[PDB]
Coordinates of N, CA and C in Angstrom, one line a residue:
Chain U
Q1 N 97.2 135.4 59.5 CA 97.8 136.8 59.7 C 99.0 136.7 60.6
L2 N 99.0 135.7 61.6 CA 100.1 135.5 62.4 C 101.3 135.0 61.5
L3 N 101.0 134.1 60.6 CA 102.0 133.5 59.7 C 102.6 134.6 58.8
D4 N 101.8 135.5 58.4 CA 102.3 136.6 57.6 C 103.3 137.4 58.4
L5 N 102.9 137.7 59.6 CA 103.6 138.6 60.5 C 105.0 137.9 60.9
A6 N 104.9 136.6 61.0 CA 106.1 135.8 61.3 C 107.1 136.0 60.1
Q7 N 106.6 135.8 58.9 CA 107.3 135.9 57.7 C 108.0 137.3 57.7
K8 N 107.2 138.3 58.1 CA 107.6 139.7 58.0 C 108.7 140.1 59.0
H9 N 108.7 139.5 60.1 CA 109.6 140.0 61.2 C 110.7 139.0 61.5
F10 N 110.5 137.7 61.3 CA 111.4 136.7 61.8 C 112.2 136.1 60.7
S11 N 111.9 136.4 59.4 CA 112.5 135.6 58.4 C 114.0 135.7 58.2
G12 N 114.6 136.7 58.9 CA 116.0 137.0 58.8 C 116.8 136.0 59.7
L13 N 116.0 135.4 60.6 CA 116.6 134.5 61.6 C 117.2 133.3 60.9
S14 N 118.5 133.0 61.4 CA 119.3 131.9 60.8 C 118.8 130.5 61.1
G15 N 118.9 129.6 60.1 CA 118.6 128.2 60.3 C 119.6 127.3 59.6
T16 N 120.9 127.5 60.0 CA 122.0 126.9 59.2 C 122.8 125.9 60.1
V17 N 125.6 121.4 64.7 CA 124.3 121.5 65.4 C 124.5 121.1 66.8
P18 N 124.3 122.0 67.8 CA 124.1 121.5 69.2 C 122.8 120.6 69.2
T19 N 123.1 119.3 69.3 CA 122.0 118.3 69.7 C 122.5 117.8 71.1
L20 N 121.5 117.2 71.8 CA 121.6 116.8 73.2 C 122.1 115.4 73.4
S21 N 123.3 115.3 74.1 CA 123.8 114.0 74.5 C 122.7 113.4 75.4
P22 N 122.6 112.0 75.5 CA 121.7 111.4 76.5 C 122.2 111.9 77.8
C23 N 121.4 111.9 78.9 CA 121.9 112.2 80.2 C 121.8 111.0 81.1
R24 N 122.9 110.6 81.7 CA 123.0 109.5 82.6 C 122.5 109.8 83.9
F25 N 121.5 109.0 84.4 CA 121.0 109.1 85.7 C 121.7 108.2 86.7
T26 N 121.8 108.7 87.9 CA 122.6 108.0 88.9 C 121.8 107.9 90.3
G27 N 121.7 106.7 90.8 CA 121.2 106.5 92.2 C 122.1 107.1 93.2
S28 N 121.7 108.0 94.0 CA 122.6 108.9 94.7 C 121.8 109.7 95.7
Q29 N 122.5 110.3 96.7 CA 121.9 111.1 97.7 C 122.8 112.3 98.0
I30 N 122.2 113.5 98.0 CA 122.8 114.7 98.5 C 122.1 115.3 99.7
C31 N 122.9 115.4 100.8 CA 122.3 115.9 102.1 C 123.1 117.1 102.6
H32 N 122.4 118.2 102.6 CA 122.8 119.4 103.2 C 122.1 119.5 104.5
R33 N 122.8 119.0 105.6 CA 122.3 119.1 106.9 C 122.6 120.5 107.4
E34 N 121.5 121.1 107.8 CA 121.5 122.5 108.4 C 120.5 122.6 109.4
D35 N 120.9 122.3 110.7 CA 119.9 122.0 111.7 C 119.2 123.3 112.1
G36 N 119.9 124.5 111.7 CA 119.4 125.8 112.1 C 118.2 126.2 111.3
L37 N 117.8 125.5 110.2 CA 116.6 125.8 109.5 C 115.5 125.1 110.3
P38 N 114.2 125.5 110.1 CA 113.1 125.1 111.0 C 112.3 123.9 110.5
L39 N 112.4 123.7 109.1 CA 111.8 122.5 108.6 C 112.7 121.8 107.5
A40 N 112.5 120.5 107.4 CA 113.4 119.7 106.5 C 112.6 119.6 105.2
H41 N 113.4 119.7 104.1 CA 112.9 119.5 102.7 C 113.6 118.2 102.2
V42 N 112.8 117.3 101.6 CA 113.3 116.1 101.0 C 112.6 116.0 99.6
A43 N 113.5 115.9 98.6 CA 113.0 115.5 97.2 C 113.6 114.2 96.8
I44 N 112.7 113.3 96.3 CA 113.1 111.9 95.9 C 112.5 111.6 94.5
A45 N 113.3 110.9 93.7 CA 112.9 110.7 92.3 C 113.6 109.5 91.7
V46 N 112.9 108.8 90.9 CA 113.5 107.7 90.0 C 113.7 108.3 88.6
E47 N 114.5 107.6 87.8 CA 114.6 108.0 86.4 C 113.3 107.8 85.7
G48 N 112.8 108.9 85.1 CA 111.6 108.9 84.3 C 111.8 108.7 82.9
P49 N 110.8 108.5 82.0 CA 111.0 108.2 80.6 C 111.4 109.3 79.6
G50 N 111.0 110.6 79.9 CA 111.3 111.6 79.0 C 110.0 112.0 78.2
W51 N 110.1 113.1 77.5 CA 108.9 113.9 77.0 C 108.0 113.0 76.2
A52 N 108.6 112.2 75.3 CA 107.9 111.6 74.2 C 107.1 110.3 74.6
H53 N 107.6 109.6 75.6 CA 107.1 108.3 75.9 C 105.6 108.3 76.4
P54 N 104.8 107.3 75.9 CA 103.4 107.2 76.3 C 103.1 106.7 77.7
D55 N 104.2 106.5 78.4 CA 104.1 106.0 79.8 C 103.7 107.2 80.7
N56 N 104.1 108.4 80.2 CA 103.9 109.7 81.0 C 102.4 109.8 81.3
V57 N 101.5 109.3 80.5 CA 100.1 109.3 80.8 C 99.7 108.5 82.0
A58 N 100.1 107.2 81.9 CA 99.8 106.3 83.0 C 100.5 106.7 84.3
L59 N 101.7 107.2 84.2 CA 102.4 107.7 85.3 C 101.7 108.9 85.9
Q60 N 101.1 109.8 85.1 CA 100.5 110.9 85.7 C 99.1 110.5 86.3
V61 N 98.6 109.4 85.8 CA 97.4 108.9 86.5 C 97.8 108.4 87.9
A62 N 98.9 107.7 88.0 CA 99.4 107.2 89.2 C 99.7 108.3 90.2
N63 N 100.5 109.3 89.7 CA 100.9 110.5 90.5 C 99.6 111.2 91.1
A64 N 98.6 111.3 90.2 CA 97.3 111.9 90.7 C 96.7 111.0 91.8
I65 N 96.8 109.7 91.7 CA 96.2 108.9 92.8 C 96.8 109.4 94.1
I66 N 98.2 109.5 94.1 CA 98.9 109.7 95.4 C 98.8 111.2 95.8
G67 N 99.0 112.1 94.9 CA 98.4 113.4 95.0 C 99.4 114.5 95.5
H68 N 98.8 115.4 96.2 CA 99.5 116.6 96.8 C 98.8 117.0 98.0
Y69 N 99.5 117.6 99.0 CA 98.8 117.9 100.3 C 99.6 119.1 100.9
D70 N 98.8 119.9 101.6 CA 99.2 121.2 102.2 C 98.3 121.4 103.5
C71 N 98.9 121.9 104.5 CA 98.2 121.9 105.8 C 97.1 122.9 105.8
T72 N 96.8 123.6 104.6 CA 95.6 124.4 104.5 C 94.5 123.6 103.9
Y73 N 94.8 122.4 103.3 CA 93.9 121.6 102.6 C 92.7 121.2 103.5
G74 N 91.5 121.4 103.0 CA 90.3 121.3 103.8 C 90.0 119.9 104.1
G75 N 90.4 119.0 103.2 CA 90.0 117.6 103.1 C 90.4 116.8 104.4
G76 N 91.6 117.0 104.8 CA 92.2 116.3 106.0 C 92.1 114.8 105.9
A77 N 91.6 114.2 107.0 CA 91.5 112.7 107.2 C 90.7 112.0 106.2
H78 N 89.7 112.7 105.7 CA 88.7 112.2 104.8 C 89.2 112.1 103.4
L79 N 90.5 112.6 103.1 CA 91.0 112.8 101.8 C 91.1 111.4 101.1
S80 N 91.1 111.5 99.8 CA 91.1 110.3 99.0 C 92.4 109.6 99.0
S81 N 93.5 110.4 98.8 CA 94.8 109.8 98.8 C 95.2 109.3 100.2
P82 N 95.6 108.0 100.3 CA 96.1 107.5 101.6 C 97.3 108.3 102.1
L83 N 98.2 108.7 101.2 CA 99.3 109.5 101.7 C 98.8 110.7 102.4
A84 N 97.8 111.4 101.8 CA 97.4 112.7 102.3 C 96.6 112.5 103.6
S85 N 95.7 111.5 103.6 CA 94.8 111.3 104.8 C 95.7 111.0 106.0
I86 N 96.7 110.1 105.8 CA 97.6 109.7 106.8 C 98.5 110.9 107.2
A87 N 99.0 111.7 106.2 CA 99.8 112.8 106.5 C 99.1 113.9 107.3
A88 N 97.8 114.0 107.0 CA 96.9 115.0 107.7 C 96.7 114.5 109.1
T89 N 96.2 113.2 109.2 CA 95.8 112.6 110.4 C 96.9 112.6 111.4
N90 N 98.1 112.3 111.0 CA 99.2 112.1 111.9 C 100.3 113.3 111.9
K91 N 99.9 114.4 111.2 CA 100.7 115.6 111.2 C 102.2 115.2 110.8
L92 N 102.3 114.3 109.8 CA 103.6 113.8 109.3 C 104.3 114.9 108.5
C93 N 103.6 115.8 107.9 CA 104.2 116.9 107.1 C 103.3 118.1 106.9
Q94 N 103.9 119.2 106.5 CA 103.2 120.4 106.1 C 102.7 120.2 104.7
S95 N 103.4 119.5 103.9 CA 103.1 119.6 102.5 C 103.9 118.5 101.7
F96 N 103.3 118.1 100.6 CA 104.1 117.3 99.6 C 103.4 117.4 98.3
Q97 N 104.2 117.1 97.3 CA 103.8 117.0 95.9 C 104.5 115.8 95.2
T98 N 103.7 115.1 94.4 CA 104.3 114.2 93.4 C 104.7 115.0 92.2
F99 N 105.7 114.6 91.5 CA 106.0 115.3 90.2 C 106.4 114.3 89.2
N100 N 106.2 114.6 87.9 CA 106.9 113.9 86.8 C 107.6 115.0 86.0
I101 N 108.8 115.3 86.3 CA 109.6 116.2 85.5 C 110.2 115.5 84.2
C102 N 109.9 116.2 83.1 CA 110.2 115.6 81.8 C 111.3 116.3 81.1
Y103 N 112.3 115.6 80.6 CA 113.3 116.1 79.7 C 113.4 115.2 78.4
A104 N 114.3 115.5 77.5 CA 114.5 114.7 76.4 C 115.1 113.3 76.8
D105 N 114.3 112.3 76.7 CA 114.8 110.9 76.9 C 115.2 110.6 78.3
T106 N 114.8 111.4 79.3 CA 115.0 111.2 80.7 C 114.1 112.1 81.6
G107 N 114.1 112.0 82.9 CA 113.2 112.7 83.8 C 113.4 112.4 85.2
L108 N 112.6 113.1 86.1 CA 112.6 112.9 87.5 C 111.1 112.5 87.9
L109 N 110.9 111.3 88.4 CA 109.6 110.9 88.8 C 109.6 110.6 90.3
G110 N 108.8 111.4 91.0 CA 108.8 111.2 92.5 C 107.9 112.2 93.2
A111 N 108.5 112.9 94.2 CA 107.8 113.5 95.3 C 108.7 114.4 96.1
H112 N 108.2 115.4 96.6 CA 108.9 116.3 97.5 C 108.0 116.5 98.7
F113 N 108.6 116.5 99.9 CA 107.8 116.8 101.1 C 108.6 117.7 102.0
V114 N 107.8 118.5 102.7 CA 108.4 119.4 103.8 C 107.7 119.0 105.1
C115 N 108.6 118.8 106.1 CA 108.0 118.2 107.3 C 108.9 118.5 108.5
Chain I
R1 N 117.6 108.0 123.3 CA 117.8 109.0 122.2 C 117.8 108.2 120.9
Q2 N 117.1 108.7 119.8 CA 117.1 108.0 118.5 C 117.3 109.0 117.4
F3 N 117.5 108.5 116.2 CA 117.8 109.4 115.0 C 116.7 110.5 115.0
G4 N 117.1 111.7 115.0 CA 116.2 112.8 115.1 C 116.5 113.8 116.1
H5 N 116.9 113.4 117.3 CA 117.6 114.2 118.2 C 118.8 113.5 118.9
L6 N 119.8 113.2 118.0 CA 121.1 112.8 118.5 C 121.9 114.0 118.9
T7 N 122.1 114.9 117.9 CA 122.9 116.1 118.2 C 122.6 117.2 117.1
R8 N 123.3 118.3 117.2 CA 123.1 119.5 116.4 C 124.3 119.7 115.5
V9 N 124.0 119.7 114.2 CA 125.1 119.7 113.2 C 124.7 120.8 112.1
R10 N 125.6 121.7 111.8 CA 125.3 122.7 110.8 C 126.4 122.7 109.7
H11 N 125.9 122.8 108.5 CA 126.6 123.2 107.3 C 127.5 122.1 106.7
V12 N 126.9 120.8 106.8 CA 127.8 119.7 106.4 C 127.0 118.9 105.3
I13 N 127.7 118.8 104.1 CA 127.1 118.1 103.0 C 127.7 116.7 102.8
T14 N 126.8 115.7 102.7 CA 127.1 114.3 102.6 C 126.7 113.9 101.2
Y15 N 127.7 113.6 100.3 CA 127.3 113.0 99.0 C 127.8 111.6 98.9
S16 N 126.9 110.7 98.3 CA 127.1 109.3 98.2 C 126.3 108.7 97.1
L17 N 126.4 107.4 96.9 CA 126.1 106.7 95.7 C 125.4 105.4 96.0
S18 N 124.4 105.0 95.2 CA 123.8 103.7 95.4 C 124.8 102.6 95.3
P19 N 124.7 101.5 96.0 CA 125.6 100.4 95.9 C 125.5 99.8 94.5
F20 N 124.3 99.9 93.9 CA 124.1 99.3 92.6 C 124.7 100.2 91.5
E21 N 125.2 101.3 91.8 CA 125.9 102.2 90.9 C 127.4 101.9 90.9
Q22 N 127.8 101.1 91.9 CA 129.2 101.1 92.2 C 129.8 99.7 92.4
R23 N 131.1 99.6 92.3 CA 132.0 98.4 92.5 C 132.1 98.2 94.0
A24 N 132.0 96.9 94.4 CA 132.1 96.4 95.8 C 133.6 96.5 96.3
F25 N 134.5 96.4 95.3 CA 135.9 96.3 95.7 C 136.7 97.3 94.9
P26 N 136.5 98.6 94.9 CA 137.3 99.5 94.1 C 138.7 99.4 94.5
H27 N 139.6 99.1 93.5 CA 141.0 99.1 93.5 C 141.5 98.4 94.8
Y28 N 141.1 97.2 95.0 CA 141.2 96.4 96.3 C 142.6 96.1 96.7
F29 N 143.5 95.7 95.7 CA 144.8 95.4 96.0 C 145.7 96.7 95.8
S30 N 145.5 97.4 94.7 CA 146.3 98.5 94.3 C 146.3 99.6 95.4
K31 N 145.1 99.8 96.1 CA 145.0 100.8 97.2 C 145.2 100.1 98.5
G32 N 144.8 98.8 98.6 CA 144.6 98.1 99.8 C 145.9 97.6 100.4
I33 N 146.7 97.0 99.6 CA 148.0 96.5 100.0 C 148.8 97.6 100.6
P34 N 149.0 98.8 99.9 CA 149.7 99.9 100.4 C 149.1 100.4 101.8
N35 N 147.8 100.4 101.8 CA 147.1 100.9 103.0 C 147.4 100.0 104.2
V36 N 147.5 98.6 104.0 CA 147.7 97.7 105.0 C 149.1 97.7 105.5
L37 N 150.0 97.9 104.6 CA 151.4 98.1 105.0 C 151.5 99.3 105.9
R38 N 150.8 100.4 105.5 CA 150.9 101.7 106.2 C 150.4 101.5 107.7
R39 N 149.3 100.7 107.8 CA 148.6 100.4 109.0 C 149.5 99.6 109.9
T40 N 150.3 98.7 109.3 CA 151.1 97.8 110.1 C 152.3 98.5 110.6
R41 N 153.0 99.3 109.7 CA 154.2 100.1 110.1 C 153.8 100.9 111.3
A42 N 152.5 101.4 111.3 CA 152.0 102.3 112.4 C 152.0 101.6 113.7
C43 N 151.7 100.3 113.8 CA 151.4 99.7 115.1 C 152.5 98.8 115.6
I44 N 153.4 98.3 114.7 CA 154.2 97.1 115.0 C 155.2 97.4 116.1
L45 N 155.7 98.7 116.2 CA 156.6 99.0 117.3 C 155.9 99.1 118.6
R46 N 154.6 99.1 118.6 CA 153.9 99.2 119.9 C 153.5 97.8 120.3
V47 N 153.1 96.9 119.3 CA 152.5 95.6 119.5 C 153.5 94.5 119.6
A48 N 154.4 94.5 118.6 CA 155.4 93.4 118.4 C 156.4 93.3 119.5
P49 N 157.0 94.4 120.0 CA 158.0 94.2 121.1 C 157.6 93.3 122.3
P50 N 156.4 93.4 122.9 CA 156.0 92.4 123.9 C 156.1 90.9 123.5
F51 N 155.6 90.7 122.3 CA 155.5 89.3 121.8 C 156.9 88.7 121.5
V52 N 157.8 89.6 121.1 CA 159.2 89.2 120.9 C 159.7 88.8 122.3
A53 N 159.5 89.6 123.3 CA 160.0 89.3 124.7 C 159.3 88.0 125.2
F54 N 158.1 87.8 124.9 CA 157.4 86.5 125.3 C 158.2 85.3 124.7
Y55 N 158.5 85.5 123.4 CA 159.0 84.4 122.6 C 160.3 84.0 123.2
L56 N 161.0 85.0 123.7 CA 162.4 84.9 124.2 C 162.3 84.3 125.6
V57 N 161.4 84.8 126.5 CA 161.3 84.3 127.8 C 160.9 82.8 127.8
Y58 N 160.1 82.5 126.8 CA 159.6 81.2 126.6 C 160.7 80.3 126.0
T59 N 161.4 80.8 125.1 CA 162.6 80.1 124.5 C 163.5 79.7 125.6
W60 N 163.9 80.7 126.3 CA 165.0 80.6 127.3 C 164.6 79.7 128.5
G61 N 163.4 79.9 129.0 CA 162.9 79.2 130.2 C 162.6 77.7 129.9
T62 N 162.2 77.5 128.6 CA 161.9 76.1 128.2 C 163.2 75.3 128.1
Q63 N 164.3 76.0 127.7 CA 165.6 75.3 127.6 C 166.3 75.3 128.9
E64 N 166.0 76.2 129.8 CA 166.5 76.2 131.1 C 166.0 75.0 131.9
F65 N 164.7 74.6 131.6 CA 164.1 73.5 132.1 C 164.7 72.2 131.6
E66 N 165.0 72.2 130.2 CA 165.7 71.2 129.6 C 167.1 70.9 130.3
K67 N 167.9 71.9 130.4 CA 169.3 71.8 131.0 C 169.2 71.2 132.4
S68 N 168.3 71.8 133.2 CA 168.4 71.5 134.6 C 167.9 70.0 134.9
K69 N 167.2 69.4 133.9 CA 166.8 68.0 134.0 C 167.9 67.0 133.6
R70 N 169.0 67.5 132.9 CA 170.2 66.7 132.5 C 171.1 66.5 133.7
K71 N 172.1 65.6 133.6 CA 173.2 65.6 134.6 C 174.4 66.4 134.0
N72 N 175.2 66.9 134.9 CA 176.4 67.7 134.6 C 177.6 67.0 135.3
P73 N 178.9 67.0 134.8 CA 179.9 66.1 135.3 C 180.5 66.5 136.7
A74 N 179.9 66.0 137.8 CA 180.2 66.3 139.2 C 179.3 65.5 140.1

């Protein structure tokens, strides 16, 4: 029924090419020092593989090992992730997340922390 | 005092690049020779004058010692 409705409403839509250039990744640093703000944000990432690659699975396993943390998280010192237990134990940060941002044939694999 | 409370800085953006993304010697002679000339023109009138005078006082006084050790007709 969905397919019928598609045919009924969308079929006038043109299909007659913007394709995506590779995107070059660069090892680099951008630092907006603004002492007047009360906490520091840092995001760090390596070039990731991109949507299609089977490595994204193993990478997400690894990211999950390391994890995410927030100063409301109940787990604290006893947490499974060493990053998180250590960050809780020693008040190293308010929060952090690992991420694997995916694009066509590239990506950002890393972590952001606020501290 | 260590990195973290050195001083207070606001509103300054630093952009930079990994060394492995970049040349060790960007335009080493084409920019560098001109720059070195510029650097030297800047200082030589401060630095060189004394050493000129040294060379002269040393030239003169060495040869004044020469002359005084000779005999003269009298």
